[PDB]
Scaffold this motif. Sequence first.
Motif, PDB file in Angstrom:
ATOM      1  N   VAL A   1      -2.456   1.990   6.705  1.00 53.67           N
ATOM      2  CA  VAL A   1      -1.577   0.982   7.285  1.00 53.67           C
ATOM      3  C   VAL A   1      -2.352  -0.289   7.555  1.00 53.67           C
ATOM      4  O   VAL A   1      -1.858  -1.391   7.309  1.00 53.67           O
ATOM      5  CB  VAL A   1      -0.918   1.532   8.565  1.00 53.67           C
TER       6      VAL A   1
ATOM      7  N   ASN B   1       9.499  -6.058   9.212  1.00 53.63           N
ATOM      8  CA  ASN B   1       8.938  -4.965   8.433  1.00 53.63           C
ATOM      9  C   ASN B   1       8.038  -4.104   9.292  1.00 53.63           C
ATOM     10  O   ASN B   1       8.104  -2.874   9.256  1.00 53.63           O
ATOM     11  CB  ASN B   1       8.133  -5.511   7.264  1.00 53.63           C
TER      12      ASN B   1
ATOM     13  N   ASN C   1       5.449  -4.429   0.742  1.00 52.23           N
ATOM     14  CA  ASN C   1       6.686  -3.667   0.719  1.00 52.23           C
ATOM     15  C   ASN C   1       6.655  -2.630  -0.381  1.00 52.23           C
ATOM     16  O   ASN C   1       7.025  -1.470  -0.178  1.00 52.23           O
ATOM     17  CB  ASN C   1       7.870  -4.593   0.495  1.00 52.23           C
TER      18      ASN C   1
ATOM     19  N   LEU D   1       8.466  -0.364  10.587  1.00 48.42           N
ATOM     20  CA  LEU D   1       7.410   0.511  10.131  1.00 48.42           C
ATOM     21  C   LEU D   1       6.893   1.360  11.272  1.00 48.42           C
ATOM     22  O   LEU D   1       6.657   2.557  11.100  1.00 48.42           O
ATOM     23  CB  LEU D   1       6.308  -0.335   9.511  1.00 48.42           C
TER      24      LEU D   1
ATOM     25  N   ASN E   1      14.709  -5.555   1.297  1.00 50.03           N
ATOM     26  CA  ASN E   1      14.356  -4.775   2.473  1.00 50.03           C
ATOM     27  C   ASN E   1      15.586  -4.134   3.078  1.00 50.03           C
ATOM     28  O   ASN E   1      15.584  -2.952   3.428  1.00 50.03           O
ATOM     29  CB  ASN E   1      13.697  -5.664   3.515  1.00 50.03           C
TER      30      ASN E   1
ATOM     31  N   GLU F   1       7.480   5.329  11.018  1.00 46.70           N
ATOM     32  CA  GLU F   1       6.248   6.097  10.948  1.00 46.70           C
ATOM     33  C   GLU F   1       6.077   6.980  12.164  1.00 46.70           C
ATOM     34  O   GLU F   1       5.563   8.098  12.048  1.00 46.70           O
ATOM     35  CB  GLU F   1       5.055   5.164  10.813  1.00 46.70           C
TER      36      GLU F   1
ATOM     37  N   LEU G   1       4.020   0.305   0.412  1.00 50.94           N
ATOM     38  CA  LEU G   1       4.670   1.206   1.356  1.00 50.94           C
ATOM     39  C   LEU G   1       5.787   1.991   0.698  1.00 50.94           C
ATOM     40  O   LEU G   1       5.997   3.170   1.002  1.00 50.94           O
ATOM     41  CB  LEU G   1       5.269   0.428   2.516  1.00 50.94           C
TER      42      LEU G   1
END
Lengths: 108, 173, 173, 173, 53
Positions: C55, C95, D95, C99, B95, C103, D98
């Motif tokens: 999502v 995450n 992960n 995100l 990540n 986004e 995405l």
Amino acid sequence: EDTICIGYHANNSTDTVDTVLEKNVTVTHSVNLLEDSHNGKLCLLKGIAPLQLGNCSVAGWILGNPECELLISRESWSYIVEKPNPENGTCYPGHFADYEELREQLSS
Amino acid sequence: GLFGAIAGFIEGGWTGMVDGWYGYHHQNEQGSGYAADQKSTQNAINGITNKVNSVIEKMNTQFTAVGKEFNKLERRMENLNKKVDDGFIDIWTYNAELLVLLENERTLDFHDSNVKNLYEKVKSQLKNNAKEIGNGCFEFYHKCNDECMESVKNGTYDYPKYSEESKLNREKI
Amino acid sequence: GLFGAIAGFIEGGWTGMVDGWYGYHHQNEQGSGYAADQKSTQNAINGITNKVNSVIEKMNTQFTAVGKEFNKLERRMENLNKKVDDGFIDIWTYNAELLVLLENERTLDFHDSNVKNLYEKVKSQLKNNAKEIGNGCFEFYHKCNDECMESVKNGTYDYPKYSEESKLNREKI
Amino acid sequence: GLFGAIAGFIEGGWTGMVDGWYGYHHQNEQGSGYAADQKSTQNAINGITNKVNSVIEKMNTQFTAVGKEFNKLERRMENLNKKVDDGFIDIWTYNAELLVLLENERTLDFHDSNVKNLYEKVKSQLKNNAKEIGNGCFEFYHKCNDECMESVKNGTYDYPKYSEESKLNREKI
Amino acid sequence: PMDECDAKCQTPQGAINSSLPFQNVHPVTIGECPKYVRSAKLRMVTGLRNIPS
Ligand SMILES: *[C@@H]1O[C@H](CO)[C@@H](O[C@@H]2O[C@H](CO)[C@@H](O[C@@H]3O[C@H](CO)[C@@H](O)[C@H](O)[C@@H]3O)[C@H](O)[C@H]2NC(C)=O)[C@H](O)[C@H]1NC(C)=O
Ligand SMILES: *[C@@H]1O[C@H](CO)[C@@H](O[C@@H]2O[C@H](CO)[C@@H](O)[C@H](O)[C@H]2NC(C)=O)[C@H](O)[C@H]1NC(C)=O
Ligand SMILES: *[C@@H]1O[C@H](CO)[C@@H](O)[C@H](O)[C@H]1NC(C)=O
Ligand SMILES: *[C@@H]1O[C@H](CO)[C@@H](O)[C@H](O)[C@H]1NC(C)=O
Ligand SMILES: *[C@@H]1O[C@H](CO)[C@@H](O)[C@H](O)[C@H]1NC(C)=O
Ligand SMILES: *[C@@H]1O[C@H](CO)[C@@H](O)[C@H](O)[C@H]1NC(C)=O
Ligand SMILES: *[C@@H]1O[C@H](CO)[C@@H](O)[C@H](O)[C@H]1NC(C)=O
Ligand SMILES: *[C@@H]1O[C@H](CO)[C@@H](O)[C@H](O)[C@H]1NC(C)=O
């Protein structure tokens, strides 16, 4: 005759990244996220010293082996230190069950 | 030059100016020089400040104790705790590596965008009064002093000022 | 105004119109008014629909049982299960937070892009017939009715229509 | 057409040319044909090479042993190891999903950007000499041979060459 | 070795600066710590490209 132009910064620098679209990619300024370094020391937290066994085992510490200094003044501390290959296990051997569980209980 | 400038229509960078990452170069009768764009530069840099505060802080670092150790009748748990820790380790690794890649890509794009926007700001004033030249620059059909430089930086020109000098000095061309 | 418009060459938003997120403002002899761009607006909003469906749905939520509980001769496993759960918890947290940040950044850029594209569409017709003014707008060297508005919305002008009125009313300037 | 071209000002793709993903179409007196832009095409494709090397390689795949199995007095550990593995599995899943979405989005944007940049390169030469037409193309007020095509590909025009033919053949219009 | 010095997180290879988020140094830690990876380096760009000519 006169002219106007854009401008922006470059420098002598050659520090680099890896990047999606090119590698060892050179820039002016950067920042290392990482702490790759270690001071090669056993400092102490906060002003609170750690517990040192020196050569001892946890058995030698807890039980009262006289070459393990008892150190009753040590009342609470930052963390426990050992070596990997501790010298002073018990002077009279015997199975010492749940070594794991006692250690986890004496994590903190 | 994702959006067209840097290795785009512009080729290369300039080491002369250091007070700020953007600016202009003025060229007129008094001489030449470089002068930085502290407005948009400082706004951008505030953006980067907010970035790294919003990357570092999004961790929460406990008062942690990592280690365990076990006998050899617990090998379920040994190979577990190996699998566990290596799993988590790899996840943060993956990540974070993607994060540095992407964030740096968007950072280059952020820079690219700001310079291109400014190129449209500079162009937005001097539209018919003065011309595109080559790459990176505009030539005037008139003359410009340090007042004209400082004014044109802060989004001010007074279009009628050298309107007619442009309207004539065009017309030989 | 990443790409040049919103806090870019455009400064601020308009509360008058509510039927859709984009549009035009018509100004001609019959009067003034606001009118929304349902085509590209609706296409964008279909994009956002596809986002949030892509999502939410990317989770899979089991028929789950979270909890455990233990004695005090299991402290290996207690501090484990703590470490485990807190690990996973933090990973989803980190995450997801990144995100939402990313986004939303790309969402602003998505909006920015659509308006800028439309600015080039509007400009693509009226190139020499009518001029850039200020920011946000174009002035005509001719006159335009509601038919001209509705036609120019849907990508139709008929370039020769007011070609010559532009070719003359320019020429005082 | 995020940035304005593909389903933007350009509508649709061309199946004729296959040697490379970009190019030009030449139309002059000798005839018509398609010819690819190997420079920027090859640079882009080097970018994609670096991408997928920097997606595959960022894993580290151990000499792994996945499985365990247990009795029924270990159900702590059974439902654990289930929870563990399903946790990790879902994390890599989420992960990666995405990642494919985002990377493909940025890949389309990467393409879009390169074509738009090239559109500005082509425009950068032929500014007053030749005009925007329709979408996708430029019409000349002069004439252009295969030498003019190959030269204009590699970033060379010689502006004064057909300057005056443009300066006259404009002037009927 | 052991020393009077102070820190905020610690591991056998050394006491650790708790400023930054990550190490690639050693997984075992105690305190208010970074987090481990298997990697060489991680460097964000603040600035941008350098080309003179
Ligand atoms: C604490 O740890 C020290 C260091 O390991 C222990 O001392 C060492 O113990 C070994 C045990 O094998 C000694 O070797 C033995 O020596 C005796 C002669 O004294 C001999 O009879 C045995 O056959 C064997 O060779 C070693 O010499 C000794 N070294 C030193 C420097 O003391 C110590 O016993 C431990 N004490 C406690 C209370 O745990
Ligand atoms: C820890 O173990 C080492 C063993 O290496 C001990 O070292 C001895 O130190 C004494 C002097 O104090 C010497 O006379 C011995 O010859 C040393 N032996 C070796 C093998 O080096 C050390 O003293 C032990 N420390 C504690 C606190 O028990
Ligand atoms: C580059 O310039 C900076 C600032 O002057 C300096 O710290 C650095 O040592 C220089 N490097 C070289 C190779 O000149
Ligand atoms: C970076 O990598 C490219 C790959 O071809 C190479 O050409 C270049 O010399 C490298 N630069 C450095 C400083 O390693
Ligand atoms: C802009 O610059 C002019 C001179 O160049 C100056 O007089 C004026 O005060 C400036 N305006 C602002 C808002 O900074
Ligand atoms: C475009 O608008 C004109 C009038 O403004 C109308 O007559 C025409 O049908 C419209 N075309 C489309 C495809 O909507
Ligand atoms: C560019 O093209 C011209 C002819 O079209 C050729 O003569 C010239 O060598 C080319 N230059 C480069 C750098 O490829
Ligand atoms: C710890 O790291 C910070 C940031 O890198 C730095 O300011 C400080 O001097 C460092 N201290 C030590 C002892 O390494």
